[PDB]
Each structure stands twice: as C-alpha cells, then as structure tokens.
Amino acid sequence: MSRNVDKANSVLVRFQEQQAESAGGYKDYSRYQRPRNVSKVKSIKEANEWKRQVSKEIKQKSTRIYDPSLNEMQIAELNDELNNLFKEWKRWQWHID
Amino acid sequence: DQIAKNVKLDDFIPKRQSNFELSVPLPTKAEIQECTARTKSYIQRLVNAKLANSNNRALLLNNSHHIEVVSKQMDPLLPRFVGKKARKVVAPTENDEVVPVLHMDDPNEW
Amino acid sequence: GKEVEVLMETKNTQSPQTPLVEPVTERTKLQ
Amino acid sequence: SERKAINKYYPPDYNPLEAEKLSRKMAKKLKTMNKSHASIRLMTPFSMRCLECNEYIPKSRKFNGKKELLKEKYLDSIKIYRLTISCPRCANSIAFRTDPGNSDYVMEVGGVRN
Amino acid sequence: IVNRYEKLLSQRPEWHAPWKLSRVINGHLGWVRCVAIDPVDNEWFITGSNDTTMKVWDLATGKLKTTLAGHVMTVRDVAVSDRHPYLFSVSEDKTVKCWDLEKNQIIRDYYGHLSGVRTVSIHPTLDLIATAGRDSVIKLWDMRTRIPVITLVGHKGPINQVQCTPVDPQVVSSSTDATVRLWDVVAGKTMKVLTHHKRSVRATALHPKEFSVASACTDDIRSWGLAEGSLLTNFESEKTGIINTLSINQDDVLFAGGDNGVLSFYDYKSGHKYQSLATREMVGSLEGERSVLCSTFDKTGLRLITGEADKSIKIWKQPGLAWNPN
Amino acid sequence: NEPPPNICEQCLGDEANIRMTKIPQGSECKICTLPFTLYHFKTSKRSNNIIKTLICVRCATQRNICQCCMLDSRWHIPIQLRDHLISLVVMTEEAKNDMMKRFLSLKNVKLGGAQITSDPSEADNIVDKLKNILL
Amino acid sequence: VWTNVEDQILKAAVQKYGTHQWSKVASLLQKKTARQSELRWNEYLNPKLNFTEFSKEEDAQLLDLARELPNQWRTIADMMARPAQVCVERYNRLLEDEEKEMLAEARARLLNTQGKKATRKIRERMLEESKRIAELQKRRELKQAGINVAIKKPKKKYGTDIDYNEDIVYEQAPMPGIYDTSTEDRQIKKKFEQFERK
Amino acid sequence: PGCGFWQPAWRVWLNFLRGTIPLLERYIGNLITRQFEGRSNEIVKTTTKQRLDAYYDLELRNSVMDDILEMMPESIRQKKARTILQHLSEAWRCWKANIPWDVPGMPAPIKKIIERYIKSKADAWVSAAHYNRERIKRGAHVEKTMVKKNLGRLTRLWIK
Amino acid sequence: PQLEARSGAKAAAYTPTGIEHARLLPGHTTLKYRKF
Amino acid sequence: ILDLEELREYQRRKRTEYEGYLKRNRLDMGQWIRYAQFEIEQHDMRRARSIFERALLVDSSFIPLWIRYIDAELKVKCINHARNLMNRAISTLPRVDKLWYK
Ligand SMILES: [Zn+2]
C-alpha cells in the first residue's frame, strides 16, 4: 500500500470511518463521490455538505483554468466541466427547503 | 564642526612616536586583584544562574511606596520556566555612536 | 639546503622519545 | 509506529468478516478504489518524443504515471496495460501499452519512438 | 608634518642583537600552524598542526617529547596555562579541548562554537579561557563548569587572535573586519574599537612587561596601550608580506612572520624594523610554500620558535640597521 | 541581571505594605510575546482577584506605562489617548507581527511620546500647551 | 566509422561539456562509443594537436627517433608534439533522416541549460503568476461586491511585509536635524492616496 | 514449573532500574522539555566520521579566500571570491589527475598561494589515505564507502 | 543550482533552551593547579 | 496594477521576494541597493531609508551603498536628511576620498 491512497482505502481505515459515521456522525464528504440524482437525500445536512463539496470543486476548477498555456485543450475541456459543476450546484439549490 | 568633533586628529597619530621613554605601566597589582575579584564574582554568578536555569536536578519599592517581593515554590512537575519556548529573536544593533573607521593614504597584474 | 649547511642542526623526529603514559607536569604534595 | 510493525491495533469489537463486509458496502460509494488510472512510478523504456512540444524524453527517465487496465487482453489470460506519462515542458498526456507478443511496448497516441 | 619627523629623527632605538637560525625540527607531517611554550619552566613547547595532532618538543635537545591525538580536523591554536596544568587546544573541528598534563589526556571538550575555532587565550589570572572562531564571536568559558559564561557580540566577521589581559580590557580580539576590539567581559560589551587597520588583522600579541598589544594587518603593524585603547606606534612594515605571526619578546623585540616567510624583527615601541631574514625550505619542498605561520618566544626571550609551512619548526638564536623614516 | 517592575500608584493599591511574588520568565508579554518575569500582587490580603503584570518591563519603558494598568505612567491615560494629546500639541505604531514586535520591544527608543511623558520638563510643557489650547 | 556532422557535434559538446566527461558526449552521438569518442577527439578534434604536415628537418628527426626507439610510437609522437597514427603513416611513407534528428536533439541539448529542477522551478513560478492574475481578474469581475485579496498562508510565524515595517533600522538622530522631512513624506503620501482612488 | 524464590532476580532488576533512573530523567525529562520548549539553534559536530572531509574542505577554502583578501586591493570582491574558489577547485582537480595547473592570467603570488594550499591538501589527503589503507589491512572498522574511496584514492596515487 | 558555496558563518544569541545535554553533565569539578 | 489592493498585493510579494534573497546572501550589497531603489519607486521613503540603513549595518565599508543612499535622499529633495547622512558617512569613513567630494 505504498503512495498513501492504498493506506487510506485500507480495510482498517474504512472500518474506522464506518464506526465514526455510526457513532457521532463523522462523515467525510470529500471521501465519497457526490451522488448523481438528487432527491435521494432526505436529510438537509447531507445535502448542504454535498453542495459545499461541489462549490469547492468548482473553485478548484476555476483556479486552474486561468493558467498561462491557455491554448491547450485541457483548459477548453474544463470550461465544459466548469459549466457542468455550475449546473450541479444549481440543482443542489433545489426548493424543497 | 560636528563632523570635526566626531573624528579627531590624535586618533591617527601614534603617541609613542614623539616620546620614547614614555611607557605604559603594567597595571597595579592591587588593581589587577580587584579586577579579578569583580570578574570572578560576576562570572561565578553567571554560572550559578545558568545552573539554576538547567532543568536537571543537582525587598523592593515602586515610587515612594515600599513593597515585598517573594518567589513562590511552583509545583515540581510543571515546567520550571513556563515563559520560555525557544523563540527566534532578531535584535537591532542599536549602535548610536559612530565608529571612526580610520586609515592612512600595477592594477593589471593583481 | 641552508638548514642543512653551516653549523645549524636539522633534527628528523618521527618517534616520540619520552613514553605516552608519562606526565608532562607532576603534582607531588607531601610524602 | 515503525515500518516493520508486526500487529496493528484493532478495537475490542472487530468482527473481521463483518468489517470486511462493511468496507465492501462502503467501497462502491468510495471515491478512490472505485476509479481507473491508479498512479504508478515508472521509468520510460521507449525513449521517445512528446508529439506536441517535441521534448525528447530519453530512456530510463522517471515519471509518476497512471497505470490503467486495458479490457481487451492479449490472447486470453495475460493482461496488458496503458501507462500514462506527461511531457516535462508541455502537459500532453503521452502513454503506451505493453503488448507481450514481442516482449516490448506499443505507443498509444502520445509520442513516437526513436 | 615637520614637527614630528624631526623629533623621530632625533630619537634613537636600542641595538637589539640580530637573529640566526639554530634549530630546525622537521617532525610534523603538516603545517605547524600553532606553537606554544610553558609559562612556568621553558622545557617543552607544543605545536598543533594540519597533521591533526599536536606534538610536544623539548627545547634544549629539540627532541619530540610526545604526541597528542585529540582532534579530527586540524589544530588552529593552543595555550598552556600558567595557573593550572592544562593545555587548551582548539581545532577547526569546532572543539575547544582541554588536556590534563598530569595524564596527557583530554578532559573537558567545551562545546558551543558553531564553526571552526581559531584561537584560545587562557585568562592569566582567572580559571577561565576565551575562544573565538569564524563564528564572529569570542566566547569565554568557565573551565570548571565547561560552559560558555558570556559571549562577545560586537564583531562583524571571523575573529582571529583573541588575547587575554588581566586588567579591565580583559580581551583583545582581532577580526577580518580589521577592527581589533577591547572588551569588558563584566559589562557584556565593548569598551574601545581600534579600527586603524586596512585589512584583516590576522595577528596580534600582548607585550609581556608593557601592557600593550601589537597587531598586524596585511602590512602595517600597529601597536597600542589598551589602558585607554589608544595608539602607541606604527612599525616600519612598508612592503613586508601578509603578517601571519606577531609575537613579542620580553626584551622589546617584536617579531613578525609573513606569508613570504621573511622573518622580520623590530624594536618594540620604536617602530623600527631592525632585521629581515630570508626563509628556507627543504630540497623537496617548493619556494612558494615556506612561510612562518605560527611563532612565539620563550619566557626568557633568547629563543624565537617559528612554525613554518615546510612542516618544520625553526628555533632562532641571537650592527643594527639605519633608521630612515618616510 | 534584571530591571525593576514599573507599577503605578493607583494600579498597585492604597496600602503601606503589599506582598508580591516574582515568577521569572513567567509569561510572554502581550505586546512583544517574549518571556519576562511576572510580578503578581494581591493588593489587600483578602480582596479577591490578583493583579498580574501583563507586559515586559522593556515594553512598558518604551510606552511609559504601568505594567498592570497599561496606562501612562504619569497621567494614567490609555496609550492612544495620551499619545493623541501629544500629537495634537505623532503617535506610536505597535507593529502587530510575530517577529517584528519582538524586535520593536528590544529597541530601547521610547517608541513615541513616551520620552515627553517621562521627563518633568517635557510632560509639564505639553500640559501647559494643552491648557493654553483649551483656553 | 565517423561522419563529419557527428564530429562537429562532438566538438561542440566538448566545448559545452569537458574533455574529461566522455559519457554525456557519447550519449549525444547515439552510435559512437564513450571510450571511442575520447579517442576520436584525441585524434582529430582538439586544435592544439598539429595534424598538418611539416618541414624536411622534422621528418628527418622523426625517422631518427624511429631508428633509436624501435617503433615505440606513442613516445615518438609525444617527442614530436604530433599525433601517433599520422606520424606512423609519415614514417611508412618515408542516414540523412538520422542526421536531421540527431542534430535537432544535439542542438536542443547544447542550447538548453536546463533539466528537471531548472525547468520545473521557472514553470512553477509561471503557474503562480498565472494564478495571481486569475485572482485579480476575479476580483475585477466582482468589484461591485466588496472583495479582499487573499494573503499568502503563513507556515511558521512570518511577516507580511506590507504592515509592521519589517526589522527597521533607525534614521539615526543627527546634529543638523530639520523637521521638513516629515512634511515632505506626508506630501509624498498624499499623492499615493490619489493614485489609489484612480 | 513452580520454583518460587524470585529474590535475587528482583534485586538485579532493582539495581538495573537504578542506572535507568538517571538516564530516564535526562532522556524522558529532555523529551518533555522539548515538547514544551523545542530547541533553537543546535550545533553539529565534525568529530563525526561523516561530514568531516567536507568541513575540512570548506575551512581550507575559507583560509585561501582570507589569504587572497590579505594579498591585494579589490573593488567588489565578493564576485571575485567565487572565481578564486573555482580556480582553487580546478587546481585541486589537476593535482588529483596529475595535470600541471598552469594558467597564464594567474598572477605569481595568488597562484603560488593556491599551489601551497593544494600541496597542504595533498599532504593531508595522502596521509589520510595511507592511514585508511593501514586500517583496512588490520581489519579495523572501515566504512564500505570509505574503503571504496581508499581504493580509488590509492589507485590514483599509484597512477601519479 | 543551489549546491552552493558560502560567504560567512553566524553568531546570534537567543533565550537558552534548558535541555540536559549528555556532555554538559558535571565532571572534573576539581581544577588542578601549579605549585607556586 | 489597476486597484490599490492589487498594488499592495504586488508590492508585498516583491518585498517578500527581496527579503528571501537577503536572508541567504545578506552580505551581497547589490541586492540591498536594488531593494532600496524598488522602495523609492514605490514612494515609501521610510521603507527605502530603513533598507539602506540595514545594508550599511551589514557592510559599513562599502562606498557604493553610501553614495546610492545619499543620492536617494537627495532625489526626494530631502536635503537636510541627506546632509545628515553624508555627515554620518564622513564620520564613519574619513580616509575614503569620495564621501567628502560628494
Ligand atoms: Zn497601573
């Protein structure tokens, strides 16, 4: 399990995380992938967390896309990615509450 | 005038060059002893202080009013010198008086 | 050359004469 | 605390099978582990030119690549891998495949061998 | 001015005898860049070197008494004490060690110098030594408690010789900044900063009977009473080499060794150079090497001992030169 | 070696005997964040709550203030206010930085105004000027 | 066998590298060997060697040497100041794509005073600059809203060199002290407020 | 099993603990001090086998620079210091190789000084090498790297 | 590169650490003397 | 460099960079003068003055630094301060010709 990722997703760590989730309510919304279809999330806190995560992602995307080699295609691709992120964020701002 | 005051001519001049029989006396024995005592007392004191500081074992007035200073015995478990924490500290030189840096007086070879 | 010449002696010293353990100063105080 | 550590501490209630099951349940949800292009450190055997900026990355030069499994194996039961690299100057994704028929590699829309 | 020159002309210097080579003791396998003698006796003199060793030498015979191997890097300086039977030595390994002489074995490595330490001076009166290195700082040590008691911040570059006087001007430093300082250990500060040199004053020495301190930059040997911290004289050192050593004899016979190896002698206080001596080297060695790096007289003063870069130590036995100023 | 504590008359109390303890490098000064000796006194034996010194002597000297009150040694006014008055007849800029503050503390210049407050000559003159301004 | 372009490249490399560093040079010339490269250099490339012919006297001397140091030919060469093979000879007497590619490579090498750390550092700096400009752009965009510029996160209690004034050294209170300086400073500062405003 | 009589063992352990008391008080105590107030400016120590040589070299360089400074006047000397150092290095390399280090622009005195210091270095180096060889011959805790160096250095010397 | 030579060393005084160094431990408290 | 805040950010960064370069080669004296110049340009006379002073402290025996500082002082038509500086320089170093001439 060299290079840290393996360590992170080693069974023991996972178990610990699960335990934390069970007792006290420590989740790491960084750690899990954000769900595709909203309205399968009855809790508000979770939703908020997800929204926050997406915002963070968007910010990250923004930070990188103004790099100096602007003509490279990665940046262009991200522009679409950025849009997608924005859309997701908007969706997360649903009007149930 | 100020500049003149700051740096004087006799600095540049050697004092023996005029008078040869003039000799600086080897310092008085008593004086020497006194000096030794002073420094010995001081250095000893410093060493004692240092020892005290090391963590291994082995009255006043303000204004007109008189005031008693004390030293309370702190608990022997807690850090002795709770103030200090190995801080970096840049100091100013604070050299207000100006050092006179006096002196006297083929480039292709050198 | 000149250190070798005339009357002035050059001593080549590899080995230390007096032993290694023996003192360079002593402090005897009462028999 | 020391790299050759014999036994990692477990809680007093740690049903190992149960723990494993739990992990599995929370592996589909997991971000890492449920993805492709897992990282790797590799030297470059081909010694090739980055097709965008012509940067001549020579033999044995070290990179933090991404190894990914190619689903279409060679023959039957001997896998082949895509090994992503970036050129030093321009950030173009070079990669290569390991077709073991010739005991060597194949370039994959990254650069050219020379 | 004419008023001073005339006066100088009028005054005469004393006829110090010339100096002839006597002993040469090729024994070290390295520069011999320190030398020292016993205050108490004048039987032996030790000489630290680029060997890493330091060797002890009987004067009379010239024979190598014994070696001492308590450093790693090269010895830069040593100091046998009058008041105790300790030999302090110091090397660019950053170690200021202390040899008992009842047993010829190190005792108290003093620790504190950040880098290569250049000189020691034991305080004539106290049980305290003083050392200074490229650190740019001269630390004083309590020899008992083997700790730096005080330190002397003033200097702005590496500090070479750092003599100890018994009076108030208790340390007489000398840097590459070309200041030579007079300090007050007790005050934790300077008292007077003699800036009169042009370059790195890489040599200085206390006069035995006269409470003054010759000091030498690349050429001009200044010399000064440190009571006030006031100049005494300027020597005729006009085109002599880079002054490495600057020992003073009991009988006012200041010696100066150069990077040239031209042993130059002067009458002290006069400022009158009264001899030059051409160096010598071994048939195998090169003519550039020969250079008196370290030197000192005996307590009597009839023998000058110069450690020269030939891997040698040369001891020197004994019509004066005409004056002619500027 | 250590200098003495600079505690004001109103700071310290109204009594002809106070007992205090010194705690060498007790706390870091609030201005400078640099170890110094805490003096802390109880004023009257039984009157609750101690009065610990919050600043290093050097800093106090620089600002010319009570080591407890943080007020002018002379006029017993907050540093701003006292300095402001002087300005009216230039104020101190404590540099709020990890490293720089310490440096400032160690400097011994009497920052700004402090000199005026210290000297009978200068403080008195300032006061006189102020009076004139008022009238 | 040695081609001329390759030889030229080698020569160039030697001026770039060092006549006692025959690995890099070898690498530069894909076909020729390290130990061979050095030999080649010794033979042809180095200018101080007099590869050209010489007068009859010299020839005579060479022949004499040959007679009196039986074919100890390197020694003879040394004596001459000539190269060996040539001397011996005298005594006896009495594809394109590859080139293009290698040249390109070689040129890139010799010119670029770069590697991992040199290239990386500059690139990093550039990236940082880009980021900074992006930030600025963002703030410009959101100017109608009140926005503050993000500070460089501290690592272990450092100074932000705008405020505080850094480790100040004094003006040094002198004798001819005049109070216009302060006024001047104030005046100077007045202008910068205006600049800020515009 | 079932032999009691733990006394002497117990005694032994107690006595062992005595020694530790001190060591632990320095050690554990030190650690706790560090945790509260964690060291300012430590000084490394060249009496270590590692770092010795480098340190020595540095010292030599410094000395050479000082000598050069002493020698003659300069304006903006910092720049020149580097050059001097480079020259010295080159000289050393030449010596190692047994190339004569002759540079035409080098003025006699400076050049002479450089030569002297390289000779000194050689003396220090050759002797050291010899010592190492002797140690190796004996069987006296030689470092693998050190031994390799000796082999190399000695070879070079032989060639020379 | 940063593999770099040098210009000068240092000597700056901070507050002492109060650490129990091994060598600093007491030893040879008795100083010897000469006969006179 | 549109806004004030932007300028500050830039300036700050520059200062930091200068500091970094100093911390290594404190005894350089080219860097110091550059820093001083930058400060002058920025129209923070205090800062520039401080920098020059610091440089002087590092290397008092360096005439160029002194002269540049003097020039800076004079440049801002701040003659009295400049005069004082000159005097100080003279006091420090008499046997240098140049200061007196200046
Ligand atoms: Zn108060």
Tab-separated table of N, CA and C and ligand atoms in Angstrom, chain F residues 7-8 10-11 66 68-69, ligand 1:
chain	number	residue	atom	x	y	z
F	7	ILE	N	5.041	49.613	38.200
F	7	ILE	CA	3.629	49.539	38.564
F	7	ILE	C	3.200	50.867	39.183
F	8	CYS	N	2.070	51.388	38.710
F	8	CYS	CA	1.620	52.727	39.074
F	8	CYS	C	0.993	52.752	40.466
F	10	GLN	N	-2.104	54.035	41.573
F	10	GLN	CA	-3.487	53.535	41.516
F	10	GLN	C	-3.572	52.045	41.133
F	11	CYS	N	-2.658	51.594	40.268
F	11	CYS	CA	-2.540	50.177	39.887
F	11	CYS	C	-2.369	49.309	41.125
F	66	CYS	N	2.149	51.833	33.074
F	66	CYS	CA	2.006	50.889	34.178
F	66	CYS	C	2.007	49.486	33.600
F	68	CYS	N	0.642	46.918	34.783
F	68	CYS	CA	-0.669	46.320	35.021
F	68	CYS	C	-1.786	47.100	34.331
F	69	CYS	N	-1.822	48.407	34.573
F	69	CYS	CA	-2.897	49.263	34.088
F	69	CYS	C	-2.871	49.464	32.580
K	1	ZN	ZN	-1.105	50.869	36.938
